[PDB]
From a paper:
Upon DNA damage, the ALC1/CHD1L nucleosome remodeling enzyme (remodeler) is activated by binding to poly(ADP-ribose). ALC1 has been implicated in DNA damage response and oncogenesis and differs from other remodelers by virtue of its macro domain, which binds poly(ADP-ribose) (PAR) chains at sites of DNA damage (Hassaetal., 2006; Lindahl etal., 1995; Sa-tohand Lindahl, 1992). In the absence of DNA damage, the juxtaposition of the macro domain of ALC1 against its ATPase maintains an inactive conformation. Many proteins interact with a negatively charged “acidic patch” (AP), formed by histones H2A and H2B on both faces of the nucleosome, by inserting an arginine (Arg) side chain into a pocket defined predominantly by H2A E61, E64, D90, and E92.
Strikingly, an N-ter-minal regulatory linker segment (ALC1RLS, residues 604–624) exhibited sequence similarity with LANA, including the conserved R611 that aligns with the Arg anchor of LANA. We next determined a cryo-EM structure of the cross-linked complex between a linker peptide and the nucleosome. Mutation of ALC1RLS affected the remodeling rate of ALC1 more strongly than its ATPase activity (~6.4-fold versus ~2-fold, respectively), suggesting a role of the ALC1RLS-AP interaction in the coupling of ATP hydrolysis to nucleosome mobilization. In the fully activated state of ALC1, the AP engages the ALC1RLS, which tethers the remodeler to the nucleosome and promotes efficient coupling of ATP hydrolysis to remodeling.
Author numbering:
A (entry chain H), F (entry chain D): 26 to 122
B (entry chain G), G (entry chain C): 10 to 119
C (entry chain B), H (entry chain F): 20 to 102
D (entry chain A), I (entry chain E): 38 to 135
E (entry chain K), J (entry chain L): 8 to 11
The structure:
DNA sequence: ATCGATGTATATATCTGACACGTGCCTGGAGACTAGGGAGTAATCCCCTTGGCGGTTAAAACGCGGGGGACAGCGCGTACGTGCGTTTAAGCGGTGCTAGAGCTGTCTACGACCAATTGAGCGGCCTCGGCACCGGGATTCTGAT
DNA sequence: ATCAGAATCCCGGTGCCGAGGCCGCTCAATTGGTCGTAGACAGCTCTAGCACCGCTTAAACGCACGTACGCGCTGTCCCCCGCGTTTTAACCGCCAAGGGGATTACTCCCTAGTCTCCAGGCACGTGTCAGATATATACATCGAT
């Protein structure tokens, strides 16, 4: 019997990698670091978005809590770009419904 | 019949999985409710930060004339960028090593 | 089985190599016993928490995830072993 | 016979070990140390091989970072030799309360 | 500079 | 109209104070610090108990998650005495329940 | 018919409010479910730690010949106890000040 | 309208008093401008976060809770102002 | 006339300000500093009185703790006088500076 | 000793 | 400068096992739909924020004199680095086995939901005594003689 | 040692406004019950952790040498302290206007939940070429002269 199905971001990191550097590969150990990074940053943002909802007595985490969490957690110009990317994606998604 | 299924990632124009991110937000005990735009915004941010690191790490790999990113190249990428170094200031990257850095007083006198 | 005095297995040339990576040019002979004491305190704090995660899971084997969670508790997040 | 002067090989060693990513402690001595410490918290523990490697990566990274802070303390005292008082200062200013 |  | 109710631990801090020091009082600023302390320690323990349940794929925070969170968060003797106090209370409760 | 209500705090022998602690666990998005023993155990721990600080702060008040605990006495209690100082190392207590502490090299030579 | 040069309102004698509470006996004349730079950087980090919490609440007034949350996020938990 | 020797009154000042708990920066100058910094992040902000007092408590507690670490750095260099290099070392070993 |  | 020897970086050829990819499956994401209550928002109250002024006097700013601390030089001696001949045990590989991690199936003890009822504890009100202030005397440090 | 001066400490007294107690009410904790599913737990299996042997040789060890670094001392210079005078503006008590924080009521838009597919993502197997080893030697640079 095959081993239990364990999810990873590995395929998405690779799909992003081949946009950024189509001729570059990645080692299995480096991919494990990248999977750890994505999980870490996810938990930081989701954790801060959770507190924002709590401090404002909201039941709901929305894109607005995510945007504010990003502005809290990411430094400097890294925050400016991430907020832009997040706003662009939500705009496109809303136009596509 | 129902329309042919499109991933929410495709509607968002994202590589990262909006549907999985939405499930993880719902299952992770972050709030009673998760709004529909929250996983789209979060997936876009996670994708952007992934692309930012991989670009710098792919440059470092190319500077070492190597085709594969290895943990060393991720460490060089993060530690040489002021903002990623600040984001990852308390993170240890296994098998990353350290930046080459010798204090000037330790170098031999001419 | 019982183990004793294995802290001396952290030998002088091993500590010296770590100091070299730390950029240290010249090392006082008293550093080696100082460094061993520092390392032993660090490992006690991490392993105590990792064993606590192990016992709560009712496991007998310390897993790499138990170490990773213990380090994250210390504020010393480790990438590359899962999580 | 040929000799390098004091500190010439030390600098040459610094360049080598900052270039490498290898783990610098011997694995079996470190593994016995981990087991001897764990033995105080619970008897007859087992360890995943990756659990010991995670501890070693974390421990060496911690010590290397402390030596960087220790070197800055020594240089602040206008020394080049690191001394225990420098480790104690670095740890105290870190809030490890040495 | 900072990526897209 | 009267103001909306704002709950605090102040009355229970005072009840505990009158056990340890019957003749001693507390200023309202010190009570505000004590209320902040109780909220901080609650949030720390419940937060670690939450992660413990998650790491072990449990839906329920039980007294066993609380006991482990206390052993993670409190320093040595504080942990041992807190674990004793918590265990005694749960033992008494389940006998009177 | 219905029995007279007896609080869970009194069943546990606690001053701290088991019923409110239970509500705060349920509302806090900590887990899908909260077991019946969790708020009893947590309330007993919060009560214990409260008593630990207040006892030391009450002693500091007597040493200062004060009847009433003020933030200074809380600071003196926390920082003079090694374990509470470790528990509260990153906490700032408003109006607490600092411990009296002069480095020996600064004292005048006799 | 706009405020200017208020960092010089952190007076030399005020910095001395803070150094005295820090147990400092003798103070170089260059410490005062160094200290002002440090304080300004510290306040910028806290206030930037506190304003971020204020704008998320759609409030125009920075509340003490916004400061307390800003400090808590930065690992500098403050007791005595609520929370 | 009577004169105290250098450092005698400095020690009395240390003893005094370590007994007291009041805030040591003038409140109105600090409040104007807070408002000046805030105006870069948002125009026409208002502040609760307690919000400014929370900032001042946090700021003075931060600076006092930094001066303790700075004093240890100066004493490590066998100096009595703290200097900017002592602040910069304390900030770097804390990880506040890079 | 620690409190009760 | 010069030599020369040490050791590091650059080329080339062999090899291999790690990753890049393809396939088969199934699990979990997507499509369509309903129910209902979280959040938007509009209208209102009135808290508390900003702002301005006039007095006082605490604190800041300034100048100055000179004490003692910073720090640049120098001397010396012993602690450390460099080297190498000897010893240790780490590392590799192979093998054997069984502890226990991981999984599946079944049950029921437990916790979530619910409605009815009550009193815990909250807001507000008032009182008085713990602490703030202060003026006078005690005494203890400081430093100069 | 002794003495005069400054400073801090201690005491008795006045008084005020914050802490403690009380009231009364309202909403959140209790009681009693049902439901259904989380997880206790028993049984199984096959991963991988542990123990062991034994060979090779990388690394650790220990001992010699000497040099360059630590640090102890001294001398000089000027920066900081202490403190007396003048100036500033902090503080604070008061008055005023108002902005906007903090509620309400309403209601609709959004998300949770359900069922039904069905294709994205995983575990697995395979092939090959990027990187690791090895040998050679061109080039750097160290340091004795």
């Amino acid at each position: 019997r095959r081993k239990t199905r364990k999810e990873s971001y590995a395929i998405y990191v690779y799909k992003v990698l081949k946009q950024v550097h189509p001729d570059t590969g990645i080692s299995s150990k480096a991919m494990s670091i990248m999977n750890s990074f994505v999980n870490d940053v996810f938990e930081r943002i989701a954790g801060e978005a959770s507190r924002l909802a709590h401090y404002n007595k909201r039941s709901t985490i929305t894109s607005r809590e995510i945007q504010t969490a990003v502005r809290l957690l990411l430094p400097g110009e890294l925050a400016k770009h991430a907020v832009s990317e997040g706003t662009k994606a939500v705009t496109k998604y809303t136009s596509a419904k | 019949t129902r329309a042919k299924a499109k991933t929410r990632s495709s509607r968002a124009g994202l590589q990262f999985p909006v549907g999985r991110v939405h499930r993880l937000l719902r299952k992770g005990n972050y709030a009673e409710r998760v709004g529909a735009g929250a996983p789209v915004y979060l997936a876009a941010v996670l994708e952007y930060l992934t692309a930012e690191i991989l670009e710098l790490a792919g440059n470092a790999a190319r500077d070492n004339k190597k085709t594969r990113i290895i943990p060393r190249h991720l460490q060089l990428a993060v530690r040489n960028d002021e903002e990623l170094n600040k984001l990852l200031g308390r993170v240890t990257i296994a098998q990353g090593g350290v930046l080459p850095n010798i204090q000037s007083v330790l170098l031999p006198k001419k | 089985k019982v183990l004793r005095d294995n802290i001396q297995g952290i030998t002088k040339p091993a500590i010296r190599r770590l100091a070299r990576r730390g950029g240290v040019k010249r090392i006082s002979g008293l550093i080696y016993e100082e460094t061993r004491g520092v390392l032993k305190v660090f490992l006690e704090n991490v392993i105590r928490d990792a064993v606590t995660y192990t016992e709560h899971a009712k496991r007998k084997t310390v897993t790499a995830m138990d170490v990773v969670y213990a380090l994250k508790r210390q504020g010393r997040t480790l990438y590359g072993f899962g999580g | 016979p040929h000799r390098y002067r004091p500190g010439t090989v030390a600098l040459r060693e610094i360049r080598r070990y900052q270039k490498s990513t290898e783990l610098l402690i011997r694995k079996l001595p470190f593994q016995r140390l981990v087991r001897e410490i764990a033995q105080d918290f619970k008897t007859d523990l087992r360890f995943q091989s990756s659990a010991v490697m995670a501890l070693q990566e974390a421990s060496e990274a911690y010590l290397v970072a402390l030596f960087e802070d220790t070197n800055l303390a020594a240089i602040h005292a206008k020394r080049v030799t690191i001394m225990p008082k420098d480790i104690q200062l670095a740890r105290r200013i870190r809030g490890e309360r040495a | 500079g900072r990526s897209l």
